[PDB]
Ligand SMILES: O=P(O)(O)C(O)(Cn1ccnc1)P(=O)(O)O
Ligand SMILES: C=C(C)CCOP(=O)(O)OP(=O)(O)O
Ligand SMILES: [Mg+2]
Ligand SMILES: [Mg+2]
């Protein structure tokens with residue numbers, strides 16, 4: 278249960294959840310309702326939780342009695358950047374279901390959804406500049422660039438089966454892992470801990486996020502749309518060749534033709550899907566997630582033994598057992 | 602896309618620094634306000650923050666137009682994928698994001714939190730207001746101040762921020778910087794309402810009733826009638842106001858000129874003074 282997993286920082290999340298409503302304002306009922314749609318749809322709030330967990334462990338190590346106001350704002354900032362990414366991702370992937378509810382672009386047109394994401398990006402970087410830490414300012418600005426860089430790169434290698442796993446991990450760093458890595462390090466920065474601790478907190482966030490996206494790519498093959506709350510079996514059909522396919526593409530070369538066919542033949546997608554399950558593609562991709570999770574756990578031993586650290590120890594083990 | 606705007610900008614800024622020795626509008630304002638405030642502060646050359654502020658602003662302006670043209674398909678139950686391939690939707694949003702991201706990334710690397718607070722604010726209200734623009738179309742109940750505010754967020758606010766951050770990067774007094782925000786706001790409004798005139802002389806066909814139409818809809822007893830709807834379909838000529846539309850810009854323009862009087866006599870302060878005059882010269 279994600280509820281029990283995030284128990285030690287449950288109270289911190291409830292303050293954030295009651296606060297995202299006003300995080301955009303009230304002058305614009307369209308933008309307000311567009312935000313209530315995706316915020317109220319029921320996200321997992323995993324990115325604010327890790328910020329909360331890292332902020333507390335590194336605050337105990339630094340002698341702070343409570344959390345700074347910039348800790349609690351940072352958690353609201355990362356979630357709003359994550360939300361802005363999802364909005365722009367759905368317009369890109371032509372997805373009509375997010376978190377069990379209809380996506381914004383199919384309610385208010387693609388333009389308003391794009392502007393809502395543009396607003397959420399500038400809004401978070403505006404809050405972030407008001408936190409006055411210049412180092413976090415540049416770090417998060419790098420992440421906003423990484424989301425666009427990965428999406429342009431992911432859009433240009435579709436149906437290209439000679440894509441390497443090296444490219445696949447770099448792509449998933451840009452669009453998913455860079456934000457999570459910057460959020461865990463920026464939390465350590467607002468606690469004032471040493472540079473080495475700052476660096477290892479960033480290394481936990483990038484490796485947990487890397488395996489997190491690998492699992493997100495697995496659940497597209499192994500879970501239903503109703504289960505995930507978002508369209509399932511969509512990456513392969515669009516030409517986005519995730520780790521199960523790249524692993525599978527090494528032994529069963531019939532995949533190459535079907536994907537280079539752009540699945541034009543009727544029945545081709547159904548047979549290509551079973552060719553992925555045919556091979557050890559799904560399980561070989563899972564062990565890539567386990568390895569990325571192994572590196573993430575090692576970065577935690579720099580911290581003392583605390584239930585904040587052991588929850589952060591549990592969050593990768595929860596990733597490998599997650600049906601979403 | 603991003604790499605192409607910087608090229609013709611790096612060249613256009615040189616074509617002006619060469620002309621100053623003995624679109625293109627936004628970095629010209631940054632360049633001339635940068636040097637005017639620079640010589641006042643004892644800076645013998647434009648710093649790097651001034652040079653890369655000019656490309657920051659145009660990248661925001663250009664990325665704005667790209668995202669503003671994203672298609673509305675709300676009530677489309679036909680072929681969504683066909684119109685998006687036809688109008689390059691997925692390409693437009695990705696390039697606009699990357700241009701928006703590289704701009705704030707440049708801005709973040711300048712290590713001035715006051716400019717970052719100001720610029721991100723400009724983008725924020727641009728996105729919010731453009732979401733709200735759907736309602737104000739076909740609405741009789743806007744005042745002249747409500748029009749100047751939508752026209753601020755649309756264009757004028759970005760120009761005012763560019764001219765004040767140019768003064769901030771010269772490290773001069775905050776009163777001269779505040780006067781530099783005032784040069785841009787006004788010239789921006791004065792530039793927006795003169796653009797709103799040029800089209801009508803369609804923008805009301807979609808429902809954008811600018812300052813000409815609000816100086817009307819007052820005298821013109823009805824007017825609201827026609828815009829209340831298809832109707833007589835004729836009379837869609839207009840009525841036609843413009844006297845209070847070429848004077849509205851003339852008044853804002855002389856407020857911008859008045860803000861330049863804190864700067865000493867210089868070839869940049871006079872070129873900036875001629876910027877307002879050249880905007881009204883299109884009459
Ligand atoms: O599969 P995607 O990477 O597009 C996704 O994980 C979202 N996303 C977008 C960028 N990083 C992650 P989602 O499946 O939620 O649609
Ligand atoms: C980066 C991608 C994988 C986001 C989707 O997974 P999440 O589980 O993090 O999305 P929400 O719960 O917040 O809706
Ligand atoms: Mg995607
Ligand atoms: Mg997607």
Ligand SMILES: [Mg+2]
Nearest residue numbers: 493494497512
């Ligand atoms: Mg996915």
